[PDB]
Design a protein around this ligand. Structure first.
Ligand SMILES: [Cl-]
Ligand SMILES: [Cl-]
Ligand SMILES: [Cl-]
Ligand SMILES: [Cl-]
Ligand SMILES: [Cl-]
Ligand SMILES: [Cl-]
Lengths: 174, 174, 174, 174, 174, 174
């Protein structure tokens, strides 16, 4: 048995490993989104940078989960990582809609794990998610919702113009 | 009787308390405007910041009036504060039109109080309003009129595009 | 429906709007307390500053609640703000007793909302209150209790002397 | 009755006082461990420093609990402090095993108190433990487990050599 | 036998261990005094700080004794630590009277140990106490006597006023 | 057809996408290695850091390949990422042997792609690999070979001692 493990259920341990997989999948999705917007026939630098940043953030979230797994005396177990859902991501609007779908799925997984921890009377797990994940996710979903609204406002009858302007005047670029 | 009060009519004292109520009402209106533009389904940061700044300015004007009330030996009396006139504020154009209506109402209240002070031969009151309120109000109404003209110019046949551009290129944002 | 809202009950949304009203009411109460102690016939600068600071703190708490409402995809709704319970606040002891009553009422509203969030399995709400409100309130009530004890000790048979000394030697002034 | 106490059960108040006793006992245990490794016939400076640091940490945890007791309006009550379980602590391996036993006992007491607070709907207590105790304890137990593994690896057939090397190359010394 | 011990009697070794117990008891007494004055219904910050400082000083004196025990080749032996004599400490005057009683008891224990060392022709022990304990104790008792006189002068017919003033104008606070 | 693509074969484009998969697989392998050495029952910090660094390096190599794919007008295509070959990695010696196997496989894939580029008369591809991959790989394999030799020298009859010493005195740790 583990020399450090205390109040750490096998159910939580397994769910943490699954969440790691979900975060690494999300990271991979964002890597694909980023490089799609770097295509010479797409060429929206700010959009590329937005999603490349998120790929790093999701990687870092998986790493924090893995650190916590070891701090509690659980055992990291890695599974195959499925490829992203699409090879080409459409417009900035299509991409941002796919991103918010993805983030809502991660948020629900966090809420589910928090509920398991609550049920198992695992306050360290619950605190961990509250401190490092739940508000980060709320903030990000709010940002994406703000972006969706602005993108939608800019479609008008001149979609190309709007998509350029959003990239130039809202998103961060060199 | 008051140990300091001199040349300070009961009519002015009452009118100052009413003006405090008007300024705090205005502050509350601007708080509502600000948070409406922060909604994820509205998402115009520069517009939000514009009105949040005005909520602070109107609060500060009420505080200056209350300080003056005490300096003259009058007695602050607070009344209930009515909620703003709307729960949702429409477009940036609708909001800026509502703001200029509100500011003209505050301006007329200032002019009325100045007239009362003149009639009562209360030069300290008249000076106070001239020094800290009348030109501030003229300047703000001119700014709002400038904004209205630019907003109106941008409606064209592409309202969403215009409303984005005004927020991005005229109003202050991060 | 809202594009960002997730795990955010209508009951919590409503209770957040009510709490905003309670905090803005509290802010208004403290504004009145502050200006009462600035009266030339009251003239306790440190007491004035103490309550003016609290008016700002309560305003800021309402603003944080409104920011959170929007981050979750709820809708701010403002109601009329009732005037404070008194026009004149008596002695520093009377005022500090009224303040602790007010703070206990805010604390109970926070605890009630935390309980609703717990019941609704809304950990982001619960975390939010824990992180930004509950300990701030405990700390403030402890400070007020400390002040009450010192004020009470100083009444003796020389109330005016004691009230001066407390203002001069405990409360912050210029 | 207490002027500040609110939502603070007699059960929590008592359990906090018991936990203070447990932390001060732990501090005393670590003081004994530290001075044992400073003996001229033991002479493992890094081990001495490790346990002297923990004696301070446990003292500080008791002080934080006592501060919180007063912030909530409970009453500190002190009991006799039992002497540590041993007068001589054996090898570094024996000592580190005793330390992890002790830390698991403190951790379980924290988890028990968190559970009481949950049952009593005392979110300030629960937050307090989450914010200042639970993760600190997880981190420390993980560190001790890491140390145990390294100590165990170094026993081999040359225990004295291994115990020197661990002290020199893992633990902090002058 | 000990490899370093020289001219260090078993009687001195035992008496040093007893003195450690007395100093740790004193430290614990001062911890209790400090937290009593932090109660919201007592609320004398300067008094709290005075006794919390002494709790640290007495802890440090025990640590210096334990260091010396090991430097001489004696063996630290710890005993149970009795709880302080009171749970509630009365007025600042009551507390300062209890403190000077406690310090006179520590002083007599130091003088007794110095006498034992003299009798045993143990000049290192005698020097140690002279250099690090005897004058520190004389200085502290003189300070406490000075405080008692000032506290007593301030009782008059207005005890609460006097106790506030002493805390504010003699003792160190934030 | 692509507006920028020139002298970029479909065979190279496909092989670049496969190499991206190989590098991301390698990154994932190193993530698993790193977290295995962070286990409380393994606890070799320098070994953990060594492999976590390599996980980042391999991620960065995949990113450089994807950037190049777009610069040439090829299309990134992502595939599922298989999980690492082991869940537990044995000793530092076992791990370093697995790492050099992995690196030789990456090196051969680089050499194969260089050969394809040579055959296709694609000097930009050949230069790219020479400039950013081939020498980096040679250097890393030499480092790993150096480490293997030192690890092997340290096994002796005291494997645990040797594995500690290598981690402490060759690998970088805090
Ligand atoms: Cl798939
Ligand atoms: Cl109304
Ligand atoms: Cl009312
Ligand atoms: Cl015992
Ligand atoms: Cl006793
Ligand atoms: Cl596989």
């Amino acid at each position: 048995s583990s020399q450090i493990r205390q109040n750490y259920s096998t159910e939580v341990e397994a769910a943490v490993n699954r969440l790691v997989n979900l975060y690494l999948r999300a990271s991979y999705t964002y890597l694909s989104l980023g490089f799609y917007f770097d295509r010479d026939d797409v060429a929206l630098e700010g959009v590329c940078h937005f999603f490349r940043e998120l790929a790093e953030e999701k990687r870092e979230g998986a790493e924090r989960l893995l650190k916590m797994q070891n701090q509690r005396g659980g055992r990291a177990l890695f599974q195959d990582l499925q490829k992203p859902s699409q090879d080409e991501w459409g417009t900035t609007l299509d991409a941002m809609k796919a991103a918010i779908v993805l983030e809502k799925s991660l948020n629900q997984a966090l809420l589910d794990l928090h509920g398991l921890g609550s049920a198992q009377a695992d306050p360290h797990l619950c605190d961990f998610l509250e401190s490092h994940f739940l508000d980060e996710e709320v903030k990000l979903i709010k940002k994406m919702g703000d972006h969706l609204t602005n993108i939608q406002r800019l479609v008008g009858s001149q979609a190309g113009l709007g998509e350029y302007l959003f990239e130039r005047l809202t998103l961060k670029h060199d």
